[PDB]
Amino acid sequence: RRDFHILNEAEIFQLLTRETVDSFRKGMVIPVYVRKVESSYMSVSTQSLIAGNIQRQDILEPNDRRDPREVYSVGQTVRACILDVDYYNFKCQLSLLRQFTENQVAGLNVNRNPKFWDIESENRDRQEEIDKQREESRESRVIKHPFFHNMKSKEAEDYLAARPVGDVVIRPSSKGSNHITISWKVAPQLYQHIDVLEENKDDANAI
Amino acid sequence: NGPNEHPGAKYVIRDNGDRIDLRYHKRAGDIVLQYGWKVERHLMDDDPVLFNRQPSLHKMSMMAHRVKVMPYSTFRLNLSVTSPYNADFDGDEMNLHVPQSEETRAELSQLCA
Amino acid sequence: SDGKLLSLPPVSIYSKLNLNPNQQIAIDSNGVEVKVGDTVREFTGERRQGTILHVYR
Amino acid sequence: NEDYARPEWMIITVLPVPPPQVRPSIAMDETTQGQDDLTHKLSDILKANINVQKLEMDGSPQHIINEVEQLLQFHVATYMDNDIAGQPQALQKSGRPVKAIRARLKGKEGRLR
Amino acid sequence: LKHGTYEKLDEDGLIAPGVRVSGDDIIIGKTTPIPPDTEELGQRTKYHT
Amino acid sequence: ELTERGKLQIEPESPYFDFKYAKNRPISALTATPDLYLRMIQAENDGLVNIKVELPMLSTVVDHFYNILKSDGTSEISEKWNALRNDAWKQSLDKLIPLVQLNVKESIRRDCERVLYFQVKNSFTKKIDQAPYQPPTYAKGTIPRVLTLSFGEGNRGDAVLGVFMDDSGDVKSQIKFDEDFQSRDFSDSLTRYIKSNNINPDIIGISGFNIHTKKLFDKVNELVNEERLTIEYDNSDKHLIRVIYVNDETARLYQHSSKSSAEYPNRPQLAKYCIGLAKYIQSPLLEYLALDESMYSLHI
DNA sequence: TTTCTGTCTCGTGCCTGGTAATCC
RNA sequence: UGCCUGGUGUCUUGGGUGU
DNA sequence: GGATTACACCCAAGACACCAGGCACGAGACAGAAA
Ligand SMILES: [Mg+2]
Structure with a gap:
C-alpha cells in the first residue's frame, strides 16, 4: 500500500469548513453576517465561521458619501461577493458593490453553443415567464355618493336618457382609480363625460 | 415607546401566534408591523372596563366605566355611583376587569355601561 | 437539499447540524433578512408559500 | 340502559x-418531592391486589382470604369515598384523613364550585 | 438562577448593610449540591454541579 | 424534450439545468460522461423531461429501403402498387422506430452504468489504499504509537481531550485538559504529560468539527517546535514528533456506533472519537472494515 | 530483627421492609 | 471579540380587612 | 341518617416517610513464619 496520505490545503479546508473549493471561490454571492463595523472596514462572518473583511471602498457605493456605521450596523446581515480566498488561513475578502451582488445571475458555466443548446427555446420561455410576472390583478371601485352609479359610458348615457336635461351621474373612470368620469345630459340623446383627476387620495375606494 | 413609557406596548403578537416581548428585545425600533398582527398596548383613556365590588348583591354591582389614567394609587369614582356599589371611601376595595376583544368591548359599552 | 428521498439507518447518519441563529441566516431576493418560521412566497414557478423550517446555504 | 348503564357494571x-x-x-x-394522596392510595390498592393474588395460588385458609379481600375492598372503597358513615376513615401517616376523589368535588373549594 | 441581580452580594453570599435594594434583588445567596451530569465529557470545569 | 413539469421545475440551481435544452448530443461521446446520461434518465423518470433519439439521415435509409422495395413500373397500376408499398413501408417504420429507440436507450444506459461502476470502484480503491503512517528510522508497515488530541467545537466551555494508544492497539491512558488551551498552564500540562509519563507517541493527530481546531493545531505545532519534543528511539539527530490533521469519517461514525459503547461503557463520546482517530492512523483498512454497512454511506 | 503475607476484623455501602345545629 | 437567566410547593391553622 | 350552613381579600407560622437491621464490597493491621 501507498504511504499515509497527508491532507493538503484544499483537503484541510474542505474537512474543516465542510465547504468545497468549487462552491466557495471567486465570483460567488453569500449571505454573510456583519460582526463588527468600522469607518475604514467592516468585519463580517460567513455561515461556515469564515471570518471576512471588506475595505472601505466597497461597503458603500462609490457615489454615496455616507458613513459605514450609519448605513450598516452590527447584526444586519447583507449579501456579499467573494473577491479573494485565503484557503490556508480561512480568510476571505468580500465586495458589496451591486455590480457583483446583482449582475452575477448566470453563474453557471454551461456551454450554450447553439449546435447543442436550444437558445431560442430558453429565450422564449424567458419572455413567457417575464410576461407572467407582468400579469397582475385588478378589481372594481366602490364609492358612496347619492349621484354615483357603477355604470358604463353607454349605461350612464342610457340611464340619463330617461331623465331630463341637466341630471348628473358619476361613474368610475377608465384612466385609473385616481380618475372619475362625470356624465351629464347636455341635450336629448347628447351627453358629456368629464374626467376628474383626484389628488391626495386616502384610499382607492375613497374620494 | 416600549413597555415603560406611557403610552406604550408590552407585546407584539404575530399571525402564527408567536409573542414578541418588548422588554427583552434589543431591536424594538427594527420591528415593522404587518396588518393582522396584534399589539398588546397599554390601557388608555376611554377604554371600557368592568368594575365590581363584593358582595355582588344585584346587577348594578358590576358596571362598565371609561378609563381615565391618573396619578397616585387609588381607583377614583364619581360619588353618585357609590350608592349602587354600596361603597364608601373608608378602606373599601373594588375589582377591575379588562375586556380582551372587540366583541366583548362592544358588549360592555352597549349593555353594562 | 437536492429534492430526493433516501432511507438510511440511524447509525449511518453523521450528526445533527446544530446551528445558532448567527449561523442559520436567510436573505430573500430583495435583500431583506428573513428568519426562522417566517412565511415567504416563491417569486416564480408554482409561486407556493410556507413557513421556513430550516435554512442551509 | 342496555347500551350505557348495565347493572353488572356497578361491580368493579x-x-x-x-x-x-x-x-x-x-x-x-x-430535594424531596411529595407523592400525591391518590398515588399513595393506588399503591395501597395495588399492594392489596398483589397480596390477594399471592395468597390465592399458594394456600387458602378461608379466614385469611376473607381478611385480605376485605382489606382490598376497604382500600378500593376509601380511594373513592373517605366519608363513609359507620366505619373509621383511612388516615395518612401524618394522621390526617385521606383526600378521596369524592372530597375533591364537593364544597365551596371543590371542583364544581 | 433567579432573574434578579446577584451583583449586590458579598463574597460570603450575604448583602451588606447600607446597600439600597429593589424588588426581586437577591439578598441571600445559597446553593444546593446536585449530582453532576455527563458534562465532564468536554466541559472545561464549566459544568453545573 | 420538456414537459410542463419540466418547464416549471428545472431551475437554474437544480442539477437538471445542465441539459434543459440540449440538442443533437452525440451518442458516442456519452460513454465518456456517464453521469450526464444517468441524470437525464433520472429527470425523465421524474416526469419532467423526455429523451428522444433521432438520426439526421433517417430519410436516407427510408429512401434507400424504398428504392430496394419499390417496383420499376410506370403505369398508373404500377403507380398505385408503389403507393401501397410505400404507405405500408411508412407504417412499418412508424411501428419499428420506438422499439429500436428503446433498445438503443437500454444499451447506452448499460454502458454508462458500467462506466460509472468502474469509476466508483477506482475511487473507492484510491480511498482505501493507504499504508499506516511510517515513523522515521523504521521500516514500512510498522505500527506507530499514536496520541490524539481533540476538543470538538471550541465554544466557551470546550475542554481538550487526549487519548494515547500504543502500537498494540490498546488504550493506555486518557487525560483531560480543563484549562484554556491558550494559557501557559495548558502547554505546561501537555508537556508534562508528553515527557514525564514516558508516553513518547510517534505521531500526534488533531481533528475537530470546525475551524477552531486550526488554532489548536497551530498552538500544538508551536509547542512542539518550542520544547523540542523529539521521539524516543530505542537503543544522532533526533527527529521531532509529527503533528498532522486526520480524516475522521470513520471516527465520526465510530463515536455513534454501539460497538464502541460495548467496548468502552464508561467513556465519553469525545474519547470514542479520539480512539477512532488513533485506530484510523494505526490501520485505515481495519477502520474502514469496521463500518460494516455504514461504509456504503461514505462520500465515495 | 528483616521481610513477605494472611485472613479475619472492619469501614463504607446498601437493600428493603417494619412501623352543632336544623331539616327532610 | 468575550458576550445574558425567567422558574416556583402543598396542606393545615391563626389573626385580620370591607360589607 | 344525611346534608349543609354569605362574598371577597391580606398576612404569618408550622409540618411534610423515618429507620433499623441484615446483606455486600473492599481494605488493612497486627501477627504468622521463614530466614
Ligand atoms: Mg366602608
Whole structure:
C-alpha cells in the first residue's frame, strides 16, 4: 500500500469548513453576517465561521458619501461577493458593490453553443415567464355618493336618457382609480363625460 | 415607546401566534408591523372596563366605566355611583376587569355601561 | 437539499447540524433578512408559500 | 340502559388508573418531592391486589382470604369515598384523613364550585 | 438562577448593610449540591454541579 | 424534450439545468460522461423531461429501403402498387422506430452504468489504499504509537481531550485538559504529560468539527517546535514528533456506533472519537472494515 | 530483627421492609 | 471579540380587612 | 341518617416517610513464619 496520505490545503479546508473549493471561490454571492463595523472596514462572518473583511471602498457605493456605521450596523446581515480566498488561513475578502451582488445571475458555466443548446427555446420561455410576472390583478371601485352609479359610458348615457336635461351621474373612470368620469345630459340623446383627476387620495375606494 | 413609557406596548403578537416581548428585545425600533398582527398596548383613556365590588348583591354591582389614567394609587369614582356599589371611601376595595376583544368591548359599552 | 428521498439507518447518519441563529441566516431576493418560521412566497414557478423550517446555504 | 348503564357494571372488576395530570406530585423542598394522596392510595390498592393474588395460588385458609379481600375492598372503597358513615376513615401517616376523589368535588373549594 | 441581580452580594453570599435594594434583588445567596451530569465529557470545569 | 413539469421545475440551481435544452448530443461521446446520461434518465423518470433519439439521415435509409422495395413500373397500376408499398413501408417504420429507440436507450444506459461502476470502484480503491503512517528510522508497515488530541467545537466551555494508544492497539491512558488551551498552564500540562509519563507517541493527530481546531493545531505545532519534543528511539539527530490533521469519517461514525459503547461503557463520546482517530492512523483498512454497512454511506 | 503475607476484623455501602345545629 | 437567566410547593391553622 | 350552613381579600407560622437491621464490597493491621 501507498504511504499515509497527508491532507493538503484544499483537503484541510474542505474537512474543516465542510465547504468545497468549487462552491466557495471567486465570483460567488453569500449571505454573510456583519460582526463588527468600522469607518475604514467592516468585519463580517460567513455561515461556515469564515471570518471576512471588506475595505472601505466597497461597503458603500462609490457615489454615496455616507458613513459605514450609519448605513450598516452590527447584526444586519447583507449579501456579499467573494473577491479573494485565503484557503490556508480561512480568510476571505468580500465586495458589496451591486455590480457583483446583482449582475452575477448566470453563474453557471454551461456551454450554450447553439449546435447543442436550444437558445431560442430558453429565450422564449424567458419572455413567457417575464410576461407572467407582468400579469397582475385588478378589481372594481366602490364609492358612496347619492349621484354615483357603477355604470358604463353607454349605461350612464342610457340611464340619463330617461331623465331630463341637466341630471348628473358619476361613474368610475377608465384612466385609473385616481380618475372619475362625470356624465351629464347636455341635450336629448347628447351627453358629456368629464374626467376628474383626484389628488391626495386616502384610499382607492375613497374620494 | 416600549413597555415603560406611557403610552406604550408590552407585546407584539404575530399571525402564527408567536409573542414578541418588548422588554427583552434589543431591536424594538427594527420591528415593522404587518396588518393582522396584534399589539398588546397599554390601557388608555376611554377604554371600557368592568368594575365590581363584593358582595355582588344585584346587577348594578358590576358596571362598565371609561378609563381615565391618573396619578397616585387609588381607583377614583364619581360619588353618585357609590350608592349602587354600596361603597364608601373608608378602606373599601373594588375589582377591575379588562375586556380582551372587540366583541366583548362592544358588549360592555352597549349593555353594562 | 437536492429534492430526493433516501432511507438510511440511524447509525449511518453523521450528526445533527446544530446551528445558532448567527449561523442559520436567510436573505430573500430583495435583500431583506428573513428568519426562522417566517412565511415567504416563491417569486416564480408554482409561486407556493410556507413557513421556513430550516435554512442551509 | 342496555347500551350505557348495565347493572353488572356497578361491580368493579378492573380499575382505571388516572394519569399523573390528575394526581400531580409536589416538591416539598429543594430535594424531596411529595407523592400525591391518590398515588399513595393506588399503591395501597395495588399492594392489596398483589397480596390477594399471592395468597390465592399458594394456600387458602378461608379466614385469611376473607381478611385480605376485605382489606382490598376497604382500600378500593376509601380511594373513592373517605366519608363513609359507620366505619373509621383511612388516615395518612401524618394522621390526617385521606383526600378521596369524592372530597375533591364537593364544597365551596371543590371542583364544581 | 433567579432573574434578579446577584451583583449586590458579598463574597460570603450575604448583602451588606447600607446597600439600597429593589424588588426581586437577591439578598441571600445559597446553593444546593446536585449530582453532576455527563458534562465532564468536554466541559472545561464549566459544568453545573 | 420538456414537459410542463419540466418547464416549471428545472431551475437554474437544480442539477437538471445542465441539459434543459440540449440538442443533437452525440451518442458516442456519452460513454465518456456517464453521469450526464444517468441524470437525464433520472429527470425523465421524474416526469419532467423526455429523451428522444433521432438520426439526421433517417430519410436516407427510408429512401434507400424504398428504392430496394419499390417496383420499376410506370403505369398508373404500377403507380398505385408503389403507393401501397410505400404507405405500408411508412407504417412499418412508424411501428419499428420506438422499439429500436428503446433498445438503443437500454444499451447506452448499460454502458454508462458500467462506466460509472468502474469509476466508483477506482475511487473507492484510491480511498482505501493507504499504508499506516511510517515513523522515521523504521521500516514500512510498522505500527506507530499514536496520541490524539481533540476538543470538538471550541465554544466557551470546550475542554481538550487526549487519548494515547500504543502500537498494540490498546488504550493506555486518557487525560483531560480543563484549562484554556491558550494559557501557559495548558502547554505546561501537555508537556508534562508528553515527557514525564514516558508516553513518547510517534505521531500526534488533531481533528475537530470546525475551524477552531486550526488554532489548536497551530498552538500544538508551536509547542512542539518550542520544547523540542523529539521521539524516543530505542537503543544522532533526533527527529521531532509529527503533528498532522486526520480524516475522521470513520471516527465520526465510530463515536455513534454501539460497538464502541460495548467496548468502552464508561467513556465519553469525545474519547470514542479520539480512539477512532488513533485506530484510523494505526490501520485505515481495519477502520474502514469496521463500518460494516455504514461504509456504503461514505462520500465515495 | 528483616521481610513477605494472611485472613479475619472492619469501614463504607446498601437493600428493603417494619412501623352543632336544623331539616327532610 | 468575550458576550445574558425567567422558574416556583402543598396542606393545615391563626389573626385580620370591607360589607 | 344525611346534608349543609354569605362574598371577597391580606398576612404569618408550622409540618411534610423515618429507620433499623441484615446483606455486600473492599481494605488493612497486627501477627504468622521463614530466614
Ligand atoms: Mg366602608
